[PDB]
Every structure is written in C-alpha cells, then in structure tokens.
Design a protein around this ligand. Structure first.
Ligand SMILES: Nc1ncnc2c1ncn2[C@@H]1O[C@H](CSCC[C@H](N)C(=O)O)[C@@H](O)[C@H]1O
Ligand SMILES: [Mg+2]
Ligand SMILES: [Zn+2]
Ligand SMILES: [Zn+2]
Ligand SMILES: [Zn+2]
Lengths: 426, 10
C-alpha cells in the first residue's frame, strides 16, 4: 500500500504528496531505473552494470567499450547492452554524450509490453519536457543531440518508423534533460545517470522534506522530516554548496522555473557561504572548474596537487567555511582517501565538519557519509573517543537518510562495534 | 559528440 500519490499542484504541474503522515527516515518508494548508464568520467573505472569500482575490469569482447567487474555482471547486463554494443563499437575512440547513450537504452525499453515497475506512478511519456519554455540556445543544443543520436544509433535504428509513434526524439531529449538523476556511489562520487520516471514526479525545494540515496543503480526515497497528510513531497535537485543566485540560475537554465522557496527569497546562508574577500575566493572558484573535471575522471594525484597549492596559499586569508575553499578541502580529502594518504585525508576532512553541519542541516546523506568518512579515519589512526562520537553522529543521520535497506548501514554498525572494542581495551 | 541530472556529489 503506497504512502505517496500523484496529484495536480496549483502552479508547479504534477507532484507527489503524502497519503498518510510520515516520520523521519520512513521509506516512501524504491525503484530501479527505467534505463541508466555509467557516466563519462567513470567509464572504465566502475562496472557498467553494478557501478562499483574495481582495479581490474573486463571488457566486452565485442565492442571493447563496456567494462564489467565479473562474468555475472556481464551476463546480467547483456539485454540492456545488446542493442548498443554495435553502436559503441562503430565510434570508438569517439564516444556519445551520456544523454545520447542513456536515450539509446530508453527507446528499446519503451517497446517492452510488460509494465515497468519504475513507471508505476508516472511514465516516460508523462515526463515534463518544458518544450514551450525552452530558450533558443537550448533548442539548438537539443537539435544537436538529436543529430548525434541519429548518427550514433544508425546501425540499429535508421528511421522514426522503427520507434513507437508517440515517441518524438527532440521532445525525448528535452525530457531527459530535466528528468534525469545523477547516480552516486556509496562514497558520494558521481558514477552514472538514469531515468526514474515515478521519482521524477517530485518537485524541487532548496529545503526539501525528502531525500534520495543510491545503492548501485537502485534508488531509495525517504522522508527526512515529519510530513503531514496531504503535504507535497519535495527533493533538492541541486548541490547544497551553492548560493541563492547560483541555485536560481541553474534551476532557471535547466528546469525552466524561478525558485521562490524560503531560502532563495531570504538569501539564507549566502553570507556564510561567501565568507572572505571576493578577490581571494573568486580565484578558488575558477580553479575548481578544472579540479572538479579531474575528480570526475578519478585522477586523484592531479586533484590533490591542485588542491594542496590552493589550500597552502590561502591559509592566512580565506576561511574554511567559504563554499569554494570547502569544496577544495573535500576534493583534497577524497583524493587522499583514494590514494591511501590517510593522515592527510583526516587533516582535510576534520576541517569540513563544522561547515558541513551548517550547510547540510537536519538529515542529509552527504553529511552522513562525510561524518562516517571522518570517523573511519579517526578510528584507524587510533583516536577512539573522537571516532566514536563521529560514527555515532553518522548513524543518527544515516538511519534517516539511508535506512536498513542501504548496505552502508551494516558497514557503519561494524565500525561502531570495532571502535567500542578499542575503547574498552583502553 | 554536457552536465545534466538531478542531485550530485553534494
Ligand atoms: N519548485 C518548483 N517551482 C516551480 N516549478 C517546479 C518546481 N520544482 C519542479 N518544478 C517543475 O517540475 C519540473 C521538473 S519534474 C517534476 C514534476 C513536474 N512538475 C511534472 O509535472 O512532471 C520542472 O522543470 C518545473 O517544470
Ligand atoms: Mg513521433
Ligand atoms: Zn559489476
Ligand atoms: Zn559490447
Ligand atoms: Zn530555492
């Protein structure tokens, strides 16, 4: 029996609302994707099927593009990979934009006669395209994606008569652009992109009452606050470390609306986010463009070298709460974890804790995972009382944001039990 | 033959 239902909002189109009162941490919905793909920077780093990193991946021998952790993943991925294999092979080393590869998988799913559980509440054809609100530059970009799709798919599909007549390729890309979800791994690195049409019913708030987390491709939707009967359910489409002007620009450009939520109207936290001299932090913001691109491709040594230069040079001027300096510290922490420099990772990660408490209020999965990473570093460096406090804090957050249906909870319980054992051994 | 999609690393 569903705890959520589709309804027509006044001014926001369709939405999702609570059928019964909801408590923090309650699981509302769970979904596999209608279709998904590994993202550009992660291809060849993580398994095409399960989106897990492995030092050794094995290539599809037919295209040499898709890569898998195991013969089991390769075989289970074959129905989804079978019709794109020849297409990926044709263009190697050239590779299609993620949206093109995703839509190539979507179109063949739409020809299944069985109902897709991912479409239970809302279908692909229901998805909002905003076609009448798109700017001319956006429509030109969509026309370019259409031509790229037609070229990429030409071995499999040469004409619109080979796809359902209700499908329109231009409108499909418009739907993909405002309805796709970024898939993150357990460590909150972006590994993939997918369509989850029932979950696309949720409208946006910069102070949402629900949160989504991924376990591989699988999506869990949870309440993060108490929610009354009939209350609209919302999620945040955006990164939390963004000022209100940045948020409004991204929501206008991608999603075609002007965000009037309480935080955007009141500039909530902007002053803290921008702490320090703009002449100083604008340089960090600019450097972050390259850093975030390197991080997306998992180039950790390069990330760390760029971050260290910024962190040492600004130490006398720029506070850690500034969101651009904070992102650099987080990139530095994750680079160090991935490179095995654990003492240095803890130095950067400890510095993110109070800014994360301020900018991720309540229960947010990004803060839960960050606090867990810091507690895990403290535990292995032998600071047990500090680690225990952070691991307990992480569990308080993650029981709400992750829940027992997410496998990271069992990992956290093991760390808590190990920390407790070291404390007792004195 | 860029960046779209709800949510992300933060
Ligand atoms: N906070 C908000 N204010 C205004 N429109 C919103 C909004 N959050 C989401 N939307 C709308 O919803 C789209 C994203 S998909 C969310 C479901 C959509 N309302 C529908 O009827 O299918 C946005 O592009 C915008 O049209
Ligand atoms: Mg048509
Ligand atoms: Zn796998
Ligand atoms: Zn292949
Ligand atoms: Zn807002």
């Amino acid at each position: 029996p569903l705890k959520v239902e589709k309804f027509a909002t006044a001014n926001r189109g369709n939405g999702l609302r609570a059928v019964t009162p909801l408590r923090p941490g309650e699981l509302l919905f769970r979904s596999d994707p209608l279709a998904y793909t590994v993202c550009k920077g992660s291809r060849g780093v993580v398994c095409d099927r399960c989106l897990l990193g492995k030092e050794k991946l094995m290539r599809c021998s037919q295209c040499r593009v898709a890569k898998y952790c195991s013969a089991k993943c390769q075989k289970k991925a074959w129905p989804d990979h079978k019709r794109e294999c020849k297409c990926l092979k044709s263009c190697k080393p050239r590779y299609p934009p993620d949206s093109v590869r995703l839509l190539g998988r979507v179109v063949f799913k739409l020809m299944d006669g069985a109902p897709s559980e991912s479409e239970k509440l809302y279908s692909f054809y229901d998805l909002e395209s905003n076609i009448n609100k798109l700017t001319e530059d956006k429509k030109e970009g969509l026309r370019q994606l259409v031509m790229t799709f037609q070229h990429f798919m030409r071995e499999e599909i040469q004409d619109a008569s080979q796809l359902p007549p209700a499908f329109d390729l231009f409108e499909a890309f418009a739907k993909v652009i405002c309805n796709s979800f970024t898939i993150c791994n357990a460590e909150m690195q972006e590994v993939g992109v997918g369509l989850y049409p029932s979950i696309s019913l949720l409208n946006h708030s910069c102070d949402p009452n629900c949160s989504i987390v991924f376990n591989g491709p699988h999506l869990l939707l949870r309440a993060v606050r108490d929610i009354e009967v009939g209350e609209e359910l919302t999620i945040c489409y955006l990164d939390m470390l963004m000022t209100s002007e940045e948020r409004r620009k991204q929501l206008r450009d991608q999603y075609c609306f002007e965000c009037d939520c309480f935080r955007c109207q009141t500039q909530d936290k902007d002053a803290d986010m921008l702490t320090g001299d703009e002449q100083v932090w604008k340089e960090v913001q600019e450097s972050l463009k390259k850093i975030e691109e390197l991080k997306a491709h998992w180039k950790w040594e390069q990330v760390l070298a760029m971050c260290q230069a910024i962190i040492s040079s600004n130490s006398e001027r720029l506070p850690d709460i500034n969101i651009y300096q904070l992102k650099v510290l987080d990139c530095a922490m994750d680079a160090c974890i991935n490179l095995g420099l654990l003492e240095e990772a803890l130095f950067y990660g400890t510095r993110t804790m109070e800014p994360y408490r301020i900018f991720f209020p309540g229960s947010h999965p990004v803060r839960g995972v960050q606090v867990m990473k810091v507690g895990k570093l403290q535990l292995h460096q032998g600071m047990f009382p500090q680690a225990m406090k952070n691991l307990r804090l992480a569990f308080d957050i993650m029981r709400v944001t992750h829940g027992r249906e997410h496998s990271l909870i069992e990992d956290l319980i093991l760390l808590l039990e190990e920390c407790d054992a070291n404390i007792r051994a004195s | 033959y860029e960046k779209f999609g709800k949510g992300g690393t933060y």
